[PDB]
A paper describes a structure:
Delta-1-pyrroline-5-carboxylate synthase ([name]) is a key enzyme in proline biosynthesis pathway. This enzyme catalyses a two-step reaction that converts glutamate to l-glutamate-5-phosphate (G5P) and then to l-glutamate-5-semialdehyde. l-Glutamate-5-semialdehyde will spontaneously cyclize and reach equilibrium with delta-1-pyrroline-5-carboxylate (P5C). As a bifunctional enzyme, [name] has two structural domains: the glutamate kinase (GK) domain and the glutamyl phosphate reductase (GPR) domain. Our results show that [name] [name] ([name]) and P5CS2 (AtP5CS2) can form enzymatic filaments in a substrate-sensitive manner.
After obtaining active protein, we prepared cryo-samples of mixed-state [name]. Similar to the AtP5CS2 filament, the [name] filament is composed of tetramers serving as the basic helical unit. Adjacent helical units interact through assembly interfaces comprising hooks. Differing from the AtP5CS2 filament, the adjacent helical units in the [name] filament do not assemble in a completely perpendicular manner. The helical twist is slightly smaller, approximately 80°. In the resolved density map of [name], stable density for the GK region was obtained. According to our model, the GPR domain of [name] is positioned closer to GK. In the model of [name], the substrate ATP has been captured. Similar to the ADP binding in AtP5CS2, the adenine group is stabilized by the ATP binding loop of [name], and the triphosphate group interacts with the conserved functional amino acids K20, D177 and K242. We identified a small density located near the RGP binding amino acids S60, A62 and D157, implying that this could be the density of the substrate glutamate.
Numbering used by the authors:
A (entry chain G), B (entry chain F), C (entry chain B), D (entry chain H): 5 to 162, 169 to 228, 238 to 286
E (entry chain E), F (entry chain D), G (entry chain C), H (entry chain A): 72 to 86
The structure:
């Protein structure tokens, strides 16, 4: 439109992928969605953008793999007994490795080098750590590498910290790395006036902190809170659906797509 | 022999792979050596052992990949100008992802699930962190998963800490996880009475803290220091060459292979 | 509709993928499209269908890879001289291996075993060969395997034969294997009353050999000829666009999608 | 020695890998052996040689995979009933795709482009086919590509033909492609004066058609017959053990390794 | 028991 | 029966 | 000449 | 200059 004109000076993008975008039916990987996303990110990176990817959704794939392992090495007599709940940290550790190995496979097939950085909550308490991370990211972006961040859930001792979920980790990274636009890839077209299943609900062209502030009932509430916190500091935030392969290009070209969170746009 | 009789009650093994074992000629991956090692580890894990792998050697592969990227996207005129030194943290971050993606590929091809855990020096300062890592590792080993540890060099702010290198990280993990035998995979057959190139040098059947204490001149000195620290606390340590595919089986069967670091054996 | 009611007793499907569906921009693989197609085929195969895939589009990927190789091992002075045209058979041979390795990678990641069969024109001249191939395909389908046929372009001595292109190889296989529905995955929504770029053109609900026989003007003419030949013998043929991930489900459910080629439907 | 001096003008090498070299314990892939072989072949190809690889051993891996599939999708009640023998052609078709996908994976990781050509017995009956294949192989070798031949067992209607096994397919290719040395990678160090298990047996430095001709009792008899047929026409043949990673370099450097089949050397 | 006896490995891999 | 009842999936994956 | 001298490897990888 | 002009991409990929 006219209020999405900042999509022309955008140089660094922090793209966060949701769990509903990574894991498909049955808990396995969604190969089509992730492949289209990786193709779009490689095209953006070849174009001249500096793309930072904050991956998410390792707990689900990890749990699927660990259930497979239990079955394969389990025995009938046992399958007749009750089941147990698979540890959370074990699932996260198993899923992270598979997800990032798959990311490396497709990025290599796309002729793009991808790098894996893992940052915990206790690490962010040091300003010197922030400076190091900034220097490392700058050096990796100067060679056209896509840093794939995440949260070290497989070692976390864990809300009271700086960040508690990837919805907020993306905002913290975008604020720290001085990004220019933050895209929260979810499974919904954006932010609605009510529940998505409600027919009376309507899409939000842009979020207003004086009108749409208290007009929506909510998960997505954490996404909205992180978006408001990020857009308050001067980082425009776009909530868009990752089910489509051209949404990133549409928002980066200035089209009316997704929900916009901007401090200057809101009046 | 007779003093390597503890290789029968061994149940948990902490295997550390060196940089000279992972990276082959040209800085690329050594596919033959790593493939043989992965085959042996899968056979051990299927046998009934609980194998913990402490990988190493991501800085070299990472630097090779980053030099490739610089060239591919570099331009002639530039190749005519002087070169620069690639950041250390960028190289480590790029190399780690590729190494562990390759590990996942071969372990999947071997029908074994491998898990990636990353632990930094600042994390070990918390006893509660030690308890949570122990619980996670126990839960992952109860499902026949090979936890592939490493050091988060791609985020490490960095000798004054608990551990400073993987030679000592392996010892710290073995002491904390209550392992039963620690194998330091290097490129040399063990510990010699002098430099390996010296013809007069002889292999050390077992390390004695009263005789071979100062009979050796030295890298490998860090390996020996970590081995002495680990074997002091009651964890037997074996330094063996990873160039062969059956060395792990030989040491685990009680044969005379490698250099032994034992507190009870030494007199 | 009412004339697509045969999509309920369909048990065997012969799916042919076009070149415009496999190769994306720059001659590289289209990862999103092929990933969505592989996900859909794995879902169909798990559902209870017997899916036969007749792949295509190795010449393009092969040529891209061979140009990469020429450059990488080529030298400046040479790049200053004129270029040459890369052999056709060399390109086909290089591309086939990469395409089918990628197919195996995604099918393994999808927990489906895929098999590669290659059949040439000279082989089809033997009736005993037809019986052998039928027996092999039956044995492979009884174990829930997806036979990935193709044409041995890398050994072909080469129109006068039984089949000359994959558009006709799919029809020959469907007739020989007694399939029940043949889907020709192309990049267009189907068959139009004229050129697709013509605004006055309209989609064809079903092809009539007494009306649309000569009305349509035209590549796609080979597709239409193969479709008419297949549908004459009693194998219903559907021409549908592979750019969407749910077109196969839509045609298999009886919805109005694509262009239909049926001998009984046409009047 | 002195009679292995022809290893200096060697320019094209036809390397045949046995079944005992590809498939490891349990019918799965031998990752260490194949990785070392691929590393050696990539080093040779980078050196300046023109390496042709005639792969073998898809029936075993294929049968393992098909048994896995039967079990996974089989059901207890059924496992209680008798088993069946898995078709030969289905096993070959499934195994070939996996083997060559793995070959592509390691060759890509080694920065070498590998190409897959499949040739049947009926195809060799045409001289024009021989010319076509020679032209294709020349064009593929001029771009530093490793053509990975095999036998189309998944389509073969099938001894009365030109070739019946890969031991003889390698000889036929070496004679047709005008190779300079043929290496038959087996699991034994070469040709012995008797059974390998016999302690009195001794290794044969070179095969003599007037002495060793009837001094050996025997599988390996097919290997010896193919070697004699190839070496009669003027192609030196070396039978060497593929269990070691440096045997190819040793024979190509002129060292005394393996068993030699030469028409000029024999007196 | 019967649900497991008359079941297959892939059926179990599901919830 | 018992060999199968008191067996595991990976044991079967072997001859 | 100049087009090649002031060019990069990835630019060439394209037609 | 000459070392680069009369060189290939893979030669550079080495120290
Ligand atoms: N008003 C609302 N509008 C849209 N979505 C809503 C709303 N209220 C709840 N939701 C839910 O919030 C979900 C947000 O998606 P998702 O599960 O990826 O969120 P998340 O908690 O940010 O994810 P992740 O675990 O990847 O960080 C939607 O899929 C939808 O089901
Ligand atoms: N007396 C000695 N005996 C054996 N090796 C020695 C000796 N002195 C020095 N070395 C060197 O120490 C090296 C130890 O191998 P390596 O490079 O893997 O060590 P590291 O510093 O522990 O490795 P990493 O970086 O993987 O932790 C040997 O390769 C050898 O060159
Ligand atoms: N009337 C028409 N309607 C639709 N497409 C047409 C028409 N005339 C020509 N075409 C062209 O035919 C093409 C058919 O697609 P495609 O290139 O895959 O065909 P193909 O020759 O069957 O492919 P392949 O090489 O994979 O066998 C369309 O992409 C379109 O550009
Ligand atoms: N006198 C002998 N010397 C050596 N090996 C012998 C002898 N007699 C029989 N053999 C057997 O021949 C085998 C040859 O190996 P291999 O199984 O690869 O043969 P092949 O039939 O040529 O293989 P492939 O199926 O790969 O073509 C040896 O492993 C050995 O067991």
């Amino acid at each position: 439109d006219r209020s999405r004109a900042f999509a022309r000076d955008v140089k660094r993008i922090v793209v966060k992928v949701g769990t509903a975008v990574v894991t498909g039916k049955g808990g396995r990987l969604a190969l089509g969605r992730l492949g289209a996303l990786c193709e779009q990110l490689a095209e953006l990176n070849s174009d001249g953008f500096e793309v930072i990817l904050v991956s998410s959704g390792a707990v689900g794939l990890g749990r699927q793999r660990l259930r497979y392992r239990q079955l394969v090495n389990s025995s009938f007599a046992d399958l007749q007994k009750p089941q147990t709940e698979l540890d959370g940290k074990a699932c996260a550790g198993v899923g992270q490795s598979s997800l990032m190995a798959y990311y490396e496979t497709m990025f290599d097939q796309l002729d793009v080098t991808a790098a894996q950085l893992l940052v915990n909550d206790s690490s962010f308490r040091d300003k010197d750590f922030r400076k190091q991370l900034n220097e490392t990211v700058k050096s990796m972006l100067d060679l056209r590498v896509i840093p794939i961040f995440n949260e070290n859930d497989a070692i976390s001792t864990r809300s009271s910290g700086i960040f508690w979920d990837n919805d907020s980790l993306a905002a913290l990274l975008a604020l720290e790395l001085k990004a220019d636009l933050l895209i929260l890839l979810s499974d919904v077209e954006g932010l609605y006036t009510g529940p998505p299943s409600d027919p009376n609900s309507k899409l939000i062209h842009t979020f207003v902190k004086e009108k749409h502030q208290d007009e929506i009932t909510f998960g997505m509430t954490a996404k909205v809170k992180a978006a408001v916190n990020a857009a308050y500091a001067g980082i425009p935030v776009i909530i868009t659906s990752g089910y489509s392969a051209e949404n990133i290009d549409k928002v980066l070209r200035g089209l009316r797509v997704g929900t916009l969170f901007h401090q200057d746009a809101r009046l």
